[PDB]
């Protein structure tokens, strides 16, 4: 009886840490608004109407959001799918051309600058012999002076032909659920005070992830998942100042953003079946597009993140907020996409505070670019068509991406600057709970039963 | 009975439990293991990967003493030098992932012992039927 | 289909008897009329409501047979 015999059990619940390819699955409600209005409304299996998470018992696994897989997979999938929604659309090959630009008709201030240049140019008609003279409106940030006369050109004339985005398809986010194939499972940590590294005490398996609205936001990540009860800061290594700090707070901050300039879409015929959508007349006043937050909720939430930031640096610490230090446009200013229109808004009015260890609304101006160089590819730029009417959007600032400055030489205070940097910092604020594990059945254990021959 | 509730004992629900708890529910975990323009190629690669794994496990079971059963006794004695822990503490206390990380060194030796015992059982069964 | 058969009382055989009694409340038709007269599609559309219950009964009977077989070998 003391001599035991081996037994193999198949279907034993035990998993290992693994790296596989999860498959996207959007909701069928977006298929109801059909005909290629966004990406993945036709290239995605429809969701399960009962996402079935199963709460476990007496179990503890160690997680790591920073060496995690499937954030890289989300990045690669969104980049490649973004590239895939440009091949049916039009290349602007006959548009990199000599542009005769003047000032826009406006009461000109010599100290300031007009942000619109009115450019007329030669364009080929649908017929190859006849060419026409057609005019349009652009911003300063898309044209440059080539070297009396004043002739301009597009800024991307010497790197790439800009694929015009299809005006049929839109850029609003829809929730994608990444579902694991058979043999794999997804574990989500339901602990409240979980800083995204180390053993989590209450995990639960699920077949598909929750709603991830994919936002394009460098600083001040939008439409995220709110924290449970308090502000939570997360980093891979706090004393590392080259590692970004993800701040996710509890109550959202409402932010309004608008362009008040009323624009006119005008079609120009490039060739047979080729349409170029330009800006026509500016109906009304020439104003600066901007955004608003509440003063009191911003001051309160900065007090909250100060209260949480003093847990990592001691109590007697002076915390100040200063603006971004410098770089390109979309890493020093916060950039986002308000319904197919790209704003680049100044965040100097927000990170301008100091904090000691004892009805109004902040408005901030923006710039508007039409051509973008998203993910900074070597030969891939993209024009964006103008859209009609006054454009406004309401969003919720959910978190921050901060960076501690290079403190040495007896630093009494510690300052924090905003900075977007890599886009993967945005996606790690949403896949921080989940991990992907491989189910390996067929365990083996001894018992006191030998097989009868 | 009117007024009838239900707990939906789903897939992968006996992780932290003891061995004898998971031994009842393992059948549904074995059942859920299978089913589940470039994106079709990715999902196809994932699906045929899943069936590659399932067929690998079915073949690895089949050369042992059981073809399609889920519980299987063999004729190889449990070497006490592997884990030297007796019946009650491994059948009542220990969890599964702990049991995985306790004997993750002698697994291949156990595989070879099972295969050799099954093959000599094959030749003994073929020779028992030789004299008939 | 192979996996759905395999958790039941037969692994790869095509004919399979089990230890679950046929509940007469399902169809209440005796042996001769269902073995000589009735067709297959008719038999499909006659008991297309209790099929999952039959699946669960087979699975529970096979699993308790597994634990009884494992306990029969316990004393040996």
């Amino acid at each position, epitope marked *: 009886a003391e001599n035991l015999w081996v037994t193999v059990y198949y279907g034993v619940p035990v998993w290992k840490d693994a790296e596989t390819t999860l498959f996207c699955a959007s909701d069928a409600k977006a298929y109801e608004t059909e005909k290629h209005n966004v990406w993945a409304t036709h290239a995605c299996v429809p969701t399960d109407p*009962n*996402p*079935q*998470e*199963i*709460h*476990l*018992e007496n179990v503890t696994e160690e997680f790591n959001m920073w060496k995690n897989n499937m954030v890289e997979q989300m990045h690669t999938d969104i980049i490649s799918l973004w590239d895939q929604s440009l091949k049916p659309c039009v290349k602007l090959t006959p548009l990199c051309v000599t542009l005769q630009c003047t000032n826009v008709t406006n009461n000109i201030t010599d100290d300031m600058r007009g942000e619109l240049k009115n450019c007329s140019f030669n364009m080929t008609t649908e017929l190859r012999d006849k060419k026409q003279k057609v005019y349009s409106l652009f911003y300063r940030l898309d044209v440059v002076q080539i070297n009396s006369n004043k002739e301009y050109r597009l800024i991307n004339c010497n790197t790439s032909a800009c694929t015009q985005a299809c005006p049929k398809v839109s850029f609003e986010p829809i929730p994608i659920h990444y579902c694991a194939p058979a043999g794999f499972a997804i574990l989500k940590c339901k602990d409240k005070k979980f800083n995204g590294t180390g053993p989590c005490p209450s995990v639960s398996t699920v077949q598909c992830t929750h709603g991830i609205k994919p936002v394009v936001s460098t600083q001040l990540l939008l439409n995220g998942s709110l924290a449970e009860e308090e502000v939570m800061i997360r980093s891979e290594n706090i004393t590392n100042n080259a590692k970004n700090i993800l701040v996710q707070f509890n109550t959202p901050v409402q932010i309004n953003c608008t362009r008040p300039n009323n624009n006119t879409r005008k079609s120009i015929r490039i060739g047979p079946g080729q349409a170029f959508y330009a800006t026509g007349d500016i109906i009304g006043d020439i104003r600066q597009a901007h955004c608003n937050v509440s003063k009191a909720t911003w001051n309160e939430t900065l007090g909250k993140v100060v209260k949480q930031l003093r847990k990592h640096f001691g109590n007697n610490t002076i915390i100040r907020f200063a603006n971004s230090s410098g770089g390109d446009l979309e890493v020093t200013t916060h950039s986002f996409n308000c319904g197919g229109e790209f704003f680049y808004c100044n965040t100097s009015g927000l990170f301008n505070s100091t904090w000691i260890s004892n009805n109004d609304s902040i408005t901030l101006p923006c710039r508007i670019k039409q051509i973008i160089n998203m993910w900074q590819r070597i030969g891939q730029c993209m024009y964006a068509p103008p859209i009609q009417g006054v454009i406004r959007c309401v969003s919720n600032i959910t978190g921050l991406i901060l960076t501690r400055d290079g403190g040495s030489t007896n630093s009494t205070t510690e300052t924090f600057r905003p900075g977007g940097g890599d886009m993967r910092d945005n996606w790690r604020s949403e896949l921080y709970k989940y991990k992907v594990v491989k189910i390996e059945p067929l365990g083996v254990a001894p018992t006191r039963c030998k097989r009868r021959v | *009975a*009117v*007024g*009838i*509730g*239900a*707990v*939906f*004992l*789903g897939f992968l*629900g006996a992780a932290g439990s003891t061995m004898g708890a998971a031994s*009842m*529910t393992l*059948t*549904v975990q074995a*059942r859920n293991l299978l089913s589940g323009t470039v994106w079709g190629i990715k999902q196809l690669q994932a699906r045929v990967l899943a069936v590659e794994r399932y067929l690998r496990d079915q073949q690895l079971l089949g050369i042992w003493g059981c073809s399609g059963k889920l519980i299987c006794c063999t004729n190889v004695p449990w070497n006490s030098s592997w884990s030297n822990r007796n019946l009650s503490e491994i059948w009542d206390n220990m969890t599964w992932l702990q049991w995985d990380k306790e004997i993750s060194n002698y697994t291949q030796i156990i595989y070879g012992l099972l295969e050799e015992s099954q093959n000599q059982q094959e030749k003994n069964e073929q020779d028992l039927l030789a004299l008939d | 289909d192979q996996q759905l058969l395999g958790i039941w009382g037969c692994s790869g055989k095509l004919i399979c008897c089990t230890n679950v009694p046929w509940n007469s409340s399902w169809s209440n038709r005796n042996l001769s009329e269902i073995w000589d007269n009735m067709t297959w599609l008719q038999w499909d559309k006659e008991i297309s409501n209790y099929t*999952q*219950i039959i*699946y*669960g*009964l087979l*699975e*529970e009977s096979q699993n308790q047979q597994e634990k009884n077989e494992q306990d029969l070998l316990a004393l040996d």
Partner: antibody
Framework: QVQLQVSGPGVVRPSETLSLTCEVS??????????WSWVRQTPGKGLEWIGG????????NHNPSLKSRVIISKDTSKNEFSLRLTSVTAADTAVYFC???????????????????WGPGLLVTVS | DIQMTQSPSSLSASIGDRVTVTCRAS??????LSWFQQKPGKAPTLLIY???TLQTGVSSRFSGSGSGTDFSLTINNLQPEDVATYFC?????????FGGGTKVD
């Protein structure tokens, strides 16, 4: 406290509202559902079921021997099963149990077992 | 409502006797009867569900027979942990009516 622990006031004034809460919990799945039930144990009579409600819906199923005088509510977020018995006389002096009502079935077809365990009660006296 | 009568109120037996508790119903509750064990002062815990199926956790001493309106719980080898009030529960139709109580001394 233990599972299905009933707490609240132990003395109810005459013809006021008895209001008791009970530590309930969610199931192992979001697909699960319980029926939480108030039962009283009287010295005079036996065990008497007071009422209850599904965890899925908000409909209340109760014993009409108390003549629809109960307000049976729940808060799954706050682990609350609540009885608000109204017009409480001394006949409702009893030890109240709150019970979980569910089945333990194993795989998606069959029934496999029912668990109707109770938690330790709280004596409520009306005078 | 469906009346449930449990008998006896109390039954006395020595250590190791097979005793029987008889639960009768007024109407058809065919196999919807539960058997519960309650320590004096403590909560009733489950013994038998569906009137013939042994619940996992309690021993094989608690067995159940009967059908329709009449059921009988059976205790083989009566134990000192069997000192408890037993209750048979109807769960066939609303409302839930339970037994009278059977004490073991």
């Amino acid at each position: 406290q233990v599972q299905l622990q009933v707490s609240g006031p132990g003395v109810v004034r005459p013809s006021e509202t008895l209001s008791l809460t009970c530590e309930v919990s969610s199931g192992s799945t979001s697909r699960d559902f319980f029926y939480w039930s108030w039962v009283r144990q009287t010295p005079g009579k036996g065990l008497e079921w007071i009422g209850g409600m599904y965890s899925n819906s908000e409909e209340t199923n109760h014993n009409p021997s108390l003549k629809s005088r109960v307000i049976i509510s729940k808060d799954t977020s706050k682990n609350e099963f609540s009885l608000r018995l109204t017009s409480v006389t001394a006949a409702d002096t009893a030890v109240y149990f709150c019970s979980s009502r569910a089945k333990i079935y194993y795989s998606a077809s069959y029934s496999g077992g029912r668990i109707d365990v109770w938690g330790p009660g709280l004596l409520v006296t009306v005078s | 409502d469906i009346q449930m009568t449990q008998s006896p109120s109390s039954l006395s037996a020595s250590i190791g006797d097979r005793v029987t508790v008889t639960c009768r119903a007024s109407q058809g509750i065919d196999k919807d009867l539960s058997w519960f064990q309650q320590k004096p002062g403590k909560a009733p815990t489950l013994l038998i569900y569906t009137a013939s199926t042994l619940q996992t956790g309690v021993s094989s001493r608690f067995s159940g027979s009967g059908s329709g309106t009449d059921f009988s719980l059976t205790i083989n080898n009566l134990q000192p942990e069997d000192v408890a009030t037993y209750f048979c529960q109807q769960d066939f139709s609303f409302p839930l009516t339970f037994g009278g109580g059977t004490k073991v001394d």
